[PDB]
């Protein structure tokens, strides 16, 4: 145990003896974006209970949402039309994902099961095609790699890589102490980051199924994790009204985005197409847009209840926000 | 919408909105309940009497043409504060205690303290069930005491307005109401008049728990409405 602490001190010291200059010193010589005005352009209605998750499609037009009454709805964001309405076996759903090819959707919650729904059948109905079982805790997140591979996060401190064709886990990702809350994929789908309630974030390798790096610094647990468009940075969000931005290669903590006027925690985080903006949904009914380079508050997206999820279109077109009052708003 | 296909899409959306309306009226007339308890408590037998590693279980019972949905949380971890945020909209919480062990009581007390003082559990009233009372009666007449665990039991008298059973032995009563108070002391120290507690004395062979839940729910909703209309 004594040796362990040594090592940890060696690792710290190695990290310490690298911070020659913070982001602010370099970035203090760039003109800011200034003020950004975003207006509500659409309003999607039809959900009964609170909304827990949403996910944009690569088509940049369709999106899927999940609510606590046990319903999945697929919208058309241009004409405000509804394409599909899917009921769930269990009403306590917590997450949903949309396939990159637009062929499948997934969901899960307080039932230890991840369900797969096929959207393209000969019959004009949506039916479940695979139920993934084996987790001990509730499912908190899920993301498709392709039409055959999916990564899930559970409340049993473990992650897993599944095989939809057979339904058996091919890799188990153990090591977290507390239950895991969120995960994020990489553009090349060779790595993924994950954050848990033990106030630590870890980087995993999909092929070798092994932990690679660890990040610390957050005072409270982690609720939402996002990834930089370039591929080398990722930003988190905690319950202590703070969000950071950690590098991969540098292995440290960069500029911190927080203010003294916020007491409530963060629920969702997302990035802009260029990485010039950082938007996060807070518990004070509001959404805060920040300058990702200078830690400047620029714009507020002002919902009558808690904001639960966010989403930015692939081409930077617009932003969709969900909330606990069962309304979806599109800002452009 | 100036094409035939667009009109057909709008029509499909309209059908979807009519299905969602019937779902909403079905939904508005149901009351949701959450059941919490330990392994020694007979919570697993009350569900049986009323009626794989899964995560949650459901049970439906009807009284006076009113539907009640009780959700029992199954195979989960030992941490509760994270998934308890999804139940801030239920009518009431049923808490089952096996107060016939003399050992497994303090942990139940801290459990009750943690549940009652939760942030996300405000406005939610709790119905207290005291189970396996006949075992307590069989464990007290022989004389395993209570003063060795609770030293203040020796300074407790039967409260003034208690009602004993008809075939009651004098002794049993003192212990039952001591446990009931011990549980009731926790609720009265906080809440500032937004939720209440409804204790009971439940046995293994009972056929009235549904009626008690109905009455407690009726009282809770009536009190909620009276406060809302500035009458309380």
């Amino acid at each position, epitope marked *: 145990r004594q040796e362990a602490e040594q090592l940890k001190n060696q690792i710290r010291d190695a990290r310490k003896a690298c911070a020659d200059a913070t982001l602010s010193q370099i970035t203090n010589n760039i003109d800011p974006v200034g003020r950004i005005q975003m207006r509500t352009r659409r309003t999607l209605r039809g959900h009964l209970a609170k909304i827990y998750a949403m996910h944009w499609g690569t088509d940049s*037009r369709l999106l899927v949402s999940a609510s606590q009454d046990g319903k999945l709805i697929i919208w058309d964001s241009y004409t405000t039309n509804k394409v599909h309405a899917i009921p769930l076996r269990s009403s306590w759903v917590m997450t949903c994902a949309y396939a990159p090819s637009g062929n499948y959707v997934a969901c899960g919650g307080l039932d230890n099961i991840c369900s797969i729904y096929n959207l393209k059948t000969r*019959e004009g*109905n949506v039916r479940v095609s695979r139920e993934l079982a084996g987790h001990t805790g509730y499912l908190s997140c899920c993301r498709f790699l392709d039409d055959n591979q999916i990564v899930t996060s559970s409340g049993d401190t473990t992650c897993a890589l599944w095989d939809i064709e057979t339904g058996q886990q091919t890799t188990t990702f153990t090591g977290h102490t507390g239950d895991v809350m969120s995960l994020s994929l990489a553009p090349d789908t060779r790595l993924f980051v994950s954050g848990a309630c033990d106030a630590s974030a870890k980087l995993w390798d999909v092929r070798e199924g092994m932990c690679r790096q660890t990040f610390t610094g957050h005072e409270s647990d982690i609720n939402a994790i996002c990834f930089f468009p370039n591929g080398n940075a990722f930003a988190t969000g905690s319950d202590d009204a703070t969000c950071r931005l950690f590098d991969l290669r540098a292995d440290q903590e960069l500029m911190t985005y927080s203010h003294d006027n916020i007491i409530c925690g963060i629920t969702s985080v997302s990035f802009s197409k260029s990485g010039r903006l950082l938007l996060a949904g807070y518990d004070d009914f509001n959404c805060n847009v920040w300058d990702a380079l200078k830690a400047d508050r620029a714009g507020v997206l002002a919902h009558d209840n808690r904001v639960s999820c966010l989403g930015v279109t692939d081409d930077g077109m617009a932003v969709a926000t969900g909330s606990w009052d069962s309304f979806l708003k599109i800002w452009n | 919408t100036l094409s*035939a*296909e667009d009109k*057909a899409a709008v029509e499909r959306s309209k059908m979807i909105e009519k299905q969602l309306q019937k779902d909403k009226q079905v939904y508005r007339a149901t009351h949701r309940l959450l059941l919490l308890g330990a392994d020694n408590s007979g919570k697993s037998t009350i569900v049986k009497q009323m009626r794989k590693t899964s995560g949650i279980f459901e049970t439906k019972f009807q009284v006076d043409k009113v539907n009640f949905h009780m959700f029992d949380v199954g195979a989960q971890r030992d941490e509760r504060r994270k998934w308890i945020q999804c139940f801030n909209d239920v009518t009431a919480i049923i808490f089952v205690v096996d107060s016939s062990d003399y050992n497994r009581l303090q942990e139940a007390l801290n459990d009750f303290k943690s549940i009652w003082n939760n942030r996300w559990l405000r406005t939610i009233s709790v119905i207290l069930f005291l189970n396996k009372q006949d075992l307590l009666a069989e464990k007290v007449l022989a004389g395993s005491k209570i003063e060795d665990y609770f030293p203040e039991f020796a300074r407790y008298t039967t409260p003034e307005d208690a009602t004993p059973e008809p075939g009651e032995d004098p002794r049993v009563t003192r212990a039952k109401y001591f446990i009931r108070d011990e549980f009731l002391r926790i609720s009265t120290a906080s809440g500032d008049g937004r939720h209440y507690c409804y204790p009971h004395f439940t046995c293994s062979v009972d056929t009235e728990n549904a009626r008690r839940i109905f009455n407690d729910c009726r009282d809770i909703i009536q009190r909620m409405h009276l406060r809302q209309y500035e009458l309380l």
Partner: single-chain antibody
Amino acid sequence: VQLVESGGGLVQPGGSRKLSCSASGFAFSSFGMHWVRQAPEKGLEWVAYISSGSGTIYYADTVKGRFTISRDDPKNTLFLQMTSLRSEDTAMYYCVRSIYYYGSSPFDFWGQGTTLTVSASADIVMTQATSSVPVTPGESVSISCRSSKSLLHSNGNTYLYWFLQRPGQSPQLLIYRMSNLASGVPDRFSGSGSGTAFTLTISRLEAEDVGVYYCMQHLEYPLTFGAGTKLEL
């Protein structure tokens, strides 16, 4: 997924018949239904249309007060009611599925049809350049279609279809909305156009590509077809 049609027969003039199409194997209560006519020596022609919710109904301008459509969801049966059979209703009638949402592929599955022998305007005009062409098994083929009004819509869609009924079976779907490929068709067909004139190209050539190719527009409701170009190998 299979549909069955019933009725048919020979009807004396002035009679009335009840033609029907029966669905089975899918969610029939979510698909719009059409009826399409086809004379023995002419191309296809659209008859009527009923929607999934029975709230919308169209009829062809030729017959609007004579025919009548109805549907039954609990039994999955579609009906066509014909009265005062003239000397023209001597063609083949087909029942066609269709479902309308974003990204969908209407006019996908056709039935098998029936026969009916009878004893003795401002709509878009769609025409095809030729009627037949001789080719070789392995060369490139190009079939042209033209319209009288611009099929391109303000949204960005071009409502043009290719069907290519084979010599002996019911029609199927090759290209929908002038650019997109059907589900099970081989990946050697393609389509292109500019807004008024369109072409269908077949890169390779197999023995299964013989038949008559059709050109249909779905901009307005009349639903006018083309003429047809037979290929002989």
